[model samples]
Each structure stands twice: as C-alpha cells, then as structure tokens.
Target: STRDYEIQRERIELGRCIGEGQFGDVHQGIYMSNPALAVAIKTCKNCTSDSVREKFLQEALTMRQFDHPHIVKLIGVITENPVWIIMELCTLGELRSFLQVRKYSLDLASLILYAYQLSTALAYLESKRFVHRDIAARNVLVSSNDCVKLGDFGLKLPIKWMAPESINFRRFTSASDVWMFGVCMWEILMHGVKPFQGVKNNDVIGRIENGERLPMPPNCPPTLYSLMTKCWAYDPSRRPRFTELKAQLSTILEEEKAQ
Candidate 1:
C-alpha cells in the first residue's frame, strides 16, 4: 500500500534558505501542482549506506502512518538523487531558539501544552513501537500558531542527549527514549540551555556513570521534577512508559488549569 510519493525535481519551486545543517539544507518551496502550496524541502547529501537509506525512507513510511496533531506530517517526498523529505512548513523555527531567546517565555499553560503535546505524541510513537531515537527541543520545530512538532530524521547519532546505556553500548530502545525525554524536559524547563553545559562530551559519559543527574530547573514543580528523576533511573525498567508519562502530563495540565 506504500506508493512512491515522489515528484519530478522541477515540481518543487525552491525558495530562499529557510534552514540548514551540516548534512544538507532545508528550504521553503512551493509544490507546483494543482494550486501551489508552501512546503519544507529537506535535503541530504552523500547519504550512501544501504541501512541509512532504508532508515531515511523508513522515516517517510513512518510519518505516513502518523495522523496525530502533535506530530508533524509528511506531505510527500522527492525520491530523486540527494533525497528530499518534503513536509508541512512550520513558520517558526526550532523550538530551542524559541525557548532560548525568550521569544515565548513559557508560562504554566505553555509548559502544560508543550509537555502534554510532546508526551501525547511520544505516546503514539510508543504504541507504534517506533523509537524517535532523537527527542530533544533542538530536534523540534515550532509554528506561527504556537504549534510544536518533533522532526529532524537525520541518522546522526546524538553525542550528549542519550541514556547511560546508549552512551555505553550504543543501545537504543523505547526505555532509552524516556531517558532522552527527561533531557528534553530539562532543555525546555531551562530555556534551551545545552545539557551538561560546562562538561565536555567525553566527560559527560563519566559524570553520568557516577550517578549524577542534572539538577532540577528553577521552580520546577515537585511532581514534574520527580518524574524527571524517574526517567533517569539507574535501571531502565524503572522508567515510565510514554503512555504512563502521557497520562501524568495530561493530569499535570489539568491541575495547572485548575490552579
């Protein structure tokens, strides 16, 4: 049932650079079809390895199955050379920038929405048994309407945002994702400050090995802080599933609304 959603190269009206990275560039483009429309064209170069290609294409397949409001949708793809993963255009840039620059100083409601949406989205991913190996604010995109979507399907391995097991054995699993989710919460609560800020990448692995966890953000609610701690437990089984986390976040949102 998976048809090639590819289009001719020229069918995309490439525009100025909207975003970019070391691997490739992302530009705002128009789908030159029956009524042109804006899109985000993500490009990657020198993506050779068969596994990498399969995973890249797999991302497309995975996204196709997602219809969640919290998840970004894949419009189509340009399956030509230097593959292009086309997706819906979100006007605002990375979520990290928004939190970092205080473009949107998040209030209680903001925190609730971001946490609830992300948890809800991850809950869906857990049900699908698809691990979003990467789950940080830096990997998320925001829209003009205050919408947040987790994205960036590049196969690049995360250097810092990882669980202890991931750093040691290169193991990635659903439980490991919860560990990263805790880091993402830290990123959001701390206004996008880099994790292990003063520690070097190599040193971070050592620090984490010594039973050290990042301190709770200023004024972080006791319950939320407790959840973050559970996510980084020494044993993976102790970490909460996305479904459990999603429900907790939903409850937190409701409590915040009441307050």
Candidate 2:
C-alpha cells in the first residue's frame, strides 16, 4: 500500500530548507517527473501514535481535495517512513511579508480585489461543508501575479467569536466562519495588526466571549467598517452569511468599476 503512494525519493533532491514548524520541515524541491514543476515538500517526523499520524494524513488529504485558483494545491503525498506532502511552491511568500515589502497602504481597489478572491474561495469551501478555522493574513500567500491563495488549515480550534451557542451544546455553523472573515478583514486593512493588539490572547478571548470586539482600524471605509461590525455581532445567528457577503463585495467592486 505504501508503495502505491511512494514518491520517487531519488528524483526529489531536497534543496534549501524553506521553513520549519512544530509538525515538520518545508523544503524547496524539484519534481523529477517534471523539472518545471517546482514544489515545496513538507516532511513530518515519525509519530509514536496512530492518532497523530491519522491527523497529519487527514490534513494532507483535505488539502488535495481543495482545487481553486485562490487556494493552494497539494500535488501529492509520500507516505513512506517519513511522511511528505508535496505542494505548489509559493514563491512570493506570506501575506505579512508582502504587506511589509509593499509598505502598509494598498490601493483600495486592490484591497477589494483581494477580498473578493478570498470570498470566492470561502464560498467554495462552504459548499464542501468545511471551515478554515484559521483564516488570517499570515496564512495567505501572494503569488507573483498578485493573486492571493489561502493556505494553512492546521489550527482547527473553534474560533472564540463563534462559540456562544456551543455553551448549550450547539455545533459550529457556517455563520461562524464569517466571523473569522471579519477578523481577516481587520487584519488586511490594518496591515497584519492583531485584532486586539497590546492585549493578552486570553484577555482577547474573554472580551470576545463577553460580547466585546476590538476597535476598527483607523481610516477604514465606512461601508467596510459597518460590515465588519455586523460580522462581529454578539449573536452568531445574527451574522451575515457568506452569500450576502459575496453579493455585497460584488456590488462594491461593481460600483468602483463604474467610478
């Protein structure tokens, strides 16, 4: 069974190590089958428990199922002794890095474009009944052509803003995802600033749990600001759905195009 999933070890010459995290190392590698197919291979250390291995394998499988222009693709998996997940090499790096390199202020038009692309991807994810528990700028990658690709789904924590109903044993619904989308909006507009910077994560959680939200970033547009507020509504049921969000963003883009 492992042989069917075995990647040709000889062909993939591990080049420079690009990144290392608690789970594993991400390295720049060349796909021997097609040299032009440059990729990043994430290798996880051998785990002692079957549960740990299953979780990592699930992540790899989930990634492979997502196929969208705005979402990164998982090329294949190497399930040999050392588990490896081969993914498209995102050369432009993370969203935070891109923001710093470009300086904080992006043209409003460009920002709208980025938001629209993310919304489109979210729509697709919702169709599959999956939620990207962690949706932030740091998890987004900017491609050379200025496209945004959503990445990183490892933090499967129940977003604090969406846990109100869970107190009574309710499950997380799609509406919860929109709340995180608002947080993502705040991050993008504020140049990757934390939602509640200068405050402890625990305190931030406490405040959000008590029906409070961080202040809007300086100079954010009124319409966008209002939308963000609606998203952070105390009642998850009151939050706007992604369908409404998509329509609103589409309208905004259309109006801007007309202007």
Candidate 3:
C-alpha cells in the first residue's frame, strides 16, 4: 500500500537534508509504502556520465552483499529514470559530530570496545574479499546506542594506499585493508579528529603514499599504539592481516577489562 508520500514521478518530497557530498544531497524521507520506516536517500542530479551511474549502482550492490551488525544496512533501492538508494537512517549522526560534541575523551574501556567492534566489522569485510578503502571517523556512523557502522566508499582507491610492492599492479589485498584499519584506529584514538586536519586531501594522500603517518595521540594504549604503527608500516607486506588485528585488539580489550 503506497502512502501519501509515494514518489510517483521523479520528485521525492524533500524532508530535511541530513548530509551532503559532491554528488548531491542526502535527505531524510519516508517510504511511500511504509511511512513508519524512515531512510536516508542520496539523490544525484545531472549525473549524466555512465561512470557516475556505475559508481552509484556499485555502492547499492555492495551494501546488499554484507549484513554485519556494525555495517550500515541498505534498506532498499529505486533506480528508475533517476537513481535513489534508501539506507538506514542513522539517528545519532556522524561519528565526527558526536566526538566533537563530547570532546576527545571517552572511558578507556569504551575506547577499547569501539576498536574491537570496528576490527570485527573489518574482519567480516575482509572475509568477503571486499576492502573498505575509506576508513575514517567521517565515514563511521554512530547509533543512539553507541554502535558504530562503517560507511562510504566513494574515494576507495584499490592499491594506492597499499605497500609499494602491493601496488605493482592495481589490486586490493587484505594487507592493504589492514593499513586502512590502522588509520581507523588513529581516527578513533583522536576522538574522530582527521589524520591531518587543515591539510588538503591531495596532500594527505601524497603523504600517505610517501610513508608519512599521523602520530599516535597521547594516552593511547601502548599495545594498541604499537599495533597501529605496524599497520601503517611502509611495507604493505609487513602490515598485519585483519585476523592479526582482531586478535591484537581483542587482547588489548581483554587486558583493559581485567584491570
């Protein structure tokens, strides 16, 4: 049964703009068939290029492949004349905003739990042979219950962030993903602060490619800090696998819990 808000034409009654990106705006909306279910719909206008449409469809398809607890679920998709993807409405908003509002301090245990959950999700993605190239606080969405879900893969470069030899050919590997997981750890430790705030995105990319890394913040657990350093190692082959990351983070959390 279609509700009053059903989008019969190309227009969807805009509610509130929740987020925005270069492509277009993501607006909160209600599904015409199910008014009770709210969704974040990303709408792209003037996306005339086939490459643009392919990228949009890739994300929609990728979201349908995994259903991990820490991964934002894709609710539904509508691709008529215009493409629209309805994803779970994250009420708590962006992890960056949450960290900003609360300041850069969280209980040590909570911090460990956060990393544990993230590693678990990343492990799941790795098991499926998919790499979340972009792993950062901005891409992480927090729920009202403090649950975190990794989102966004628009800027995912398959081999750019990988180790030099790993970049011999343009391909993504589990090792490359581990390097990103380390970056994610850095983001979590800094309470969602960007790796290098104020630096241009291209500069950050260049730095990473040149083996420069953001230093670990103060008060970070020594074990976790060391693990992050290893993850961001100059040699991709030297980076620990997701399995290793999960085990290391688990050990750190366990030690903290026992204390």
Candidate 4:
C-alpha cells in the first residue's frame, strides 16, 4: 500500500530456502510475470515484531538506493505478513563456494577480474557516500565465472576482516570497508579459502596491532598483494579510497590479462 517498489505476494512463487542470515531465510523462487523470472527472496522470520519488520524493510530501502553492474539489484518488496525482499537471482550462487568448486579451472586473471569488479562497485558506493559495513567473499554472489555482485548483509564478530580502527574504536566507514575488501581480495586470490584459518578472533586484534596482515596468497601477483597492503594500512586515512582502489585494480587486471 506504500512504497513504489512493493510487489504482490502472488507474483512470487515461493520456493525452498536457499540460505539464512541474521535477518531471515533467503529463498530461491520464481517471480511469475511477463517472462516469469527466477529470483532470490529474503523473508522475515518474525514479521509479527514491528522492529523486525522495520529493519527488514530498511534492508530493501538501502538496496533500492544502489544501482551498479556489480551490486545486486532489488527486485521489489512484499509488505504483508511474512514480508519478503525479492532480489535478482545469481544462478551460480555464492562466490566463495563457486570458486572452491572450480578453483583449478579458474585462472589468475579470472580471480583478479572478480576483485576489479568488486572495486568498481565499491567505488560507486563510495561516490554515493555509502559505507558497506560488510565486505567479504561470503557477501558476493556469482552470476557466472566472469560476473559477480554484492549481496545480502552480515553478522558475527568478523574480527579478522575488520580494520584496526573499527575494532579499537568501533568506527565503521568507507575506509574500514576498504580494509575488509583487502581481506576479500585475498580470499578471491586464494580461491575461496577463509583468511587466517585457525586464527582466533581474540588474537586477530593483537596481530593486527602488531602490524601483521594476511600473507600474500599462494601465486598471487606481488603487485596485487601490494594493493591489498595499501587497503590494510594501519591508519584508516592512509588506506586507499575505493575510487583509488578501483583504478589501481583495473590497471593490475589489465596487466594480468596481457600476461
């Protein structure tokens, strides 16, 4: 009855849950209209709670603000009971798993392409003054080997992926996101391997304070790893802005492609 983005519940042919997050279950479904498109749906588990409903809608609202090739697009929303936030389907699913399943088949250029694509999206967000609090391989969805997009949101401590300022002062900013993106790029280069595996979150803060960062991933181009270090700068102000990161990544990507 309110927002322009609202869609009739009947339009969405709900399917089994595909994933779960702090907000609720994400279902793979079909939006039956025109061409009857496949879609991913985020449904609130507790629509009866006003607070939950507000936050659920807010997620859709935030998503509505963004439009970029590498960012997941908001399809529409169903506001009635069992509220749903419909989104575009990324057929290949999560990036981390996608890479893991086809790691050997994927080339270094392909991995760098993912990083470059993400930087473009982040740069666009930076221009819009939007800070993506969560930036990680887990939050990226792959439409194909050559295509990926930012998706969903987050939970948990995620201490290792966070910037030093974020942990020490509870500061979350575009700069902090840059730091996380560094970890994400490392994950991509590693073919979906989680960074600092076996490292405790409690110790991660100390390690960062001591200036220890994730090691250059195996066979990662030193040029690319050096970019990651720029992102992981101890001082947030010293970290490359997403715009700068985007440009540098594009250059690195083109060089990799030429090789």
Best by TM-score: 4
Q: How far does residue 191 in candidate 4 sit from its true spot (Å)?
A: 0.8
RMSD of each: 3.2, 3.5, 5.0, 2.1
The alpha-carbon lDDT assigned to residue 164 of candidate 3 equals 42
Q: TM-score ranking from best to worst?
A: 4, 1, 2, 3
Q: How high is each candidate's TM-score?
A: 0.85, 0.83, 0.78, 0.94
**Per-residue C-alpha lDDT of model 1 across residues 124-153, encoded as one tens digit per residue:** 888877755434323777764457887763
Prediction 3 TM-score vs. true: 0.78
Model 3 lDDT tens row, 132-212: 543321267776545877777221433333444445454457776677667777777787776666676555556766777
Alpha-carbon deviation at 34 in model 2, angstroms? 4.5
Cα displacement (Å) at residue 128, model 1: 0.8
What is each predicted model's overall lDDT from 0 to 1?
Answer: 0.75, 0.69, 0.69, 0.85
In candidate 3, how many Å is residue 18 off? 1.1
In model 3, where is the ten-residue run with the lowest total lDDT? Answer: 1-10
Predicted structure 1: clash tally? 0
Residue 199 accuracy (lDDT) in model 3: 72
Worst 10 residues of 1 by lDDT: 131-140
Could you tell me the TM-score of candidate 4?
Answer: 0.94
Task: Indicate the TM-score of model 1.
Answer: 0.85
